[PDB]
Swiss-Prot record:
Keywords: ATP-binding, Glycolysis, Kinase, Membrane, Mitochondrion, Mitochondrion outer membrane, Nucleotide-binding, Nucleus, Transferase, Transmembrane, Transmembrane helix. Belongs to the hexokinase family. This is Hexokinase-1. It comes from the Eukaryota. Highly expressed in flowers and siliques, at intermediate levels in roots and stems, and at lower levels in rosette and cauline leaves. One of its GO terms (biological process) is glucose mediated signaling pathway. It comes from Arabidopsis thaliana. PROSITE patterns: HEXOKINASE_1, HEXOKINASE_2. D-glucose binds at T162, K163, N197, D198, N224, E252, E283.
């Protein structure tokens, strides 16, 4: 007993994480129930099911030059897209990444937005060619990726700063109006056509290219989903209907929880030690931020209780979030017979001098267990969305983005194949998953196009 203790921990973990199809169906059903709940009243579910205030999704027929501003950290992005209609679609796109000087992260509101407006104007001046205007005012999609309370298509109030920003007067104020002011003060004739959420932007980008897009899911460091709901099937919404009766809903599905989620001691402790205990339960088991942290916690127990790394626990293994997402992807992707890549990553991250094949086999097994659970629960969530739309029986396209979907190949394959099993042979044929890149950039510019005054 010792490495038998390692195998005991691994076996119970594998069992406790299991997601047989019957359980996935119950997770999916619970998702659909929670979606109804969140739409029934504000605060109806742990799923916020927010009205996104989109009036019109892009169709692909849009023509002209459109801009986007992606502000979600100390690095922001300005970009433009040239749209040419159905056939050509996106002709050209250009962008510039700009860094916010650390002093403007904590100063006044006016100074931050003046700076952003100025970068935008210099960027606009780099247009080639009549690249722009039928005498047209330029139009901008604005992605503001800080906690925000969107109140209309073109307004939203900052709730709380993150990422080392601390401009206290900006709290509770309208970010679009703030940017507008700076755009006025700068000499740039530019209208803000839409305040954009990045997940909604991912949906918009997908729909632009594919009329059968009904939902968007982001599986990266964080997670979220948005989908197109029947405007008349939302009891909590009393506002004017959008053009096609299509109401884009921002689910905020990271906060989903259910008895049907197969949790372990490691998930419970992770949650117990988090800044938001009892919240974001689904995010804590499916998102990139957390998969590596779950792996770390199981390994730490094996190290403390079963001498996994010898008679001394590696001190680096005790550092929360030291094992990250592409570390995990890399080890899982390892096909060498001696598991070189598993050993290499463990060596680098935990600063241990040696590992055996047996240890490496356990590590890659744990990667597989954790990724598979995350991927299968993600599939269940998507299936829940398809059921809400009555598209679990029968094209329905899911626009996807995020590092997990894009680069962690085993995760993506497991998710799509599990979704296929949930759907079954008859109905799965009508379901597709497409990559919709840059929801916060091009996605936002496409929402500017679909809310243009020159439509």
């Amino acid at each position: 007993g010792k490495w038998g203790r390692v195998l005991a921990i691994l076996k119970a973990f594998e069992e406790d994480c299991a997601t047989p199809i019957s359980k996935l169906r119950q997770v999916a059903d619970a998702m659909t129930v929670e979606m109804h709940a969140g739409l029934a009243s504000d605060g109806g579910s742990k799923l916020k099911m927010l009205i996104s205030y989109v009036d019109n999704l892009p169709s692909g027929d849009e023509k002209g030059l459109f801009y986007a501003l992606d502000l979600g950290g100390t690095n922001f992005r300005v970009m433009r897209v040239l749209l040419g209609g159905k056939q050509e679609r996106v002709v050209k796109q250009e962008f510039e990444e700009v860094s916010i000087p650390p002093h403007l992260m904590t100063g006044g509101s006016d100074e931050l937005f003046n700076f952003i407006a100025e970068a935008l104007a210099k960027f606009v001046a780099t247009e080639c060619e009549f690249h722009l205007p039928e005498g047209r005012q330029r139009e901008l999609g604005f992605t503001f990726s800080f906690p925000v309370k969107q109140t209309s298509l073109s307004s939203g109030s900052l709730i709380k700063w993150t990422k080392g920003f601390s401009i206290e007067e900006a709290v509770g104020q309208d970010v679009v109006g703030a940017l507008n002011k700076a755009l006025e003060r700068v000499g740039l004739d530019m209208r803000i056509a839409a305040l954009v959420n990045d997940t909604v932007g991912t949906l918009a980008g997908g729909r632009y290219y594919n009329p059968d897009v009904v939902a968007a899911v982001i599986l990266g460091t964080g997670t979220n989903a948005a989908y197109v709901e029947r405007a008349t099937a939302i009891p909590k919404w009393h506002g004017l209907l959008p053009k096609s009766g299509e109401m884009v809903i921002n689910m905020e599905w990271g906060n989903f929880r259910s008895s049907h989620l197969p949790l372990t001691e490691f998930d419970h402790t992770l949650d117990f030690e988090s800044l938001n205990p009892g919240e974001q339960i689904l995010e804590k088991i499916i998102s990139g931020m957390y998969l590596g942290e779950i792996l770390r916690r199981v390994l730490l127990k094996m190290a403390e209780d079963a001498a996994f790394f010898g008679d001394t626990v590696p001190s680096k293994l005790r550092i929360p979030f030291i094992i990250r997402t592409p570390h995990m992807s890399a080890m899982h992707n390892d096909t060498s017979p001696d598991l070189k890549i598993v050993g290499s990553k463990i060596k680098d991250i935990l600063e241990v001098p040696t590992t055996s094949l047996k240890m490496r086999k356990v590590v890659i097994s744990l990667c597989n267990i954790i990724a598979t659970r995350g991927a299968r629960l993600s599939a269940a969530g998507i299936y829940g969305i398809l059921k809400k739309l009555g598209r679990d029986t029968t094209k329905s396209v899911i626009a996807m983005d995020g590092g997990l979907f894009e680069h962690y190949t085993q995760f993506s394959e497991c998710m799509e194949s599990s979704l296929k099993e949930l759907l079954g042979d008859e109905a799965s044929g009508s379901v597709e998953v497409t990559h919709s890149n840059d929801g916060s950039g091009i996605g936002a510019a496409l929402l500017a196009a679909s809310h243009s005054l020159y439509l």
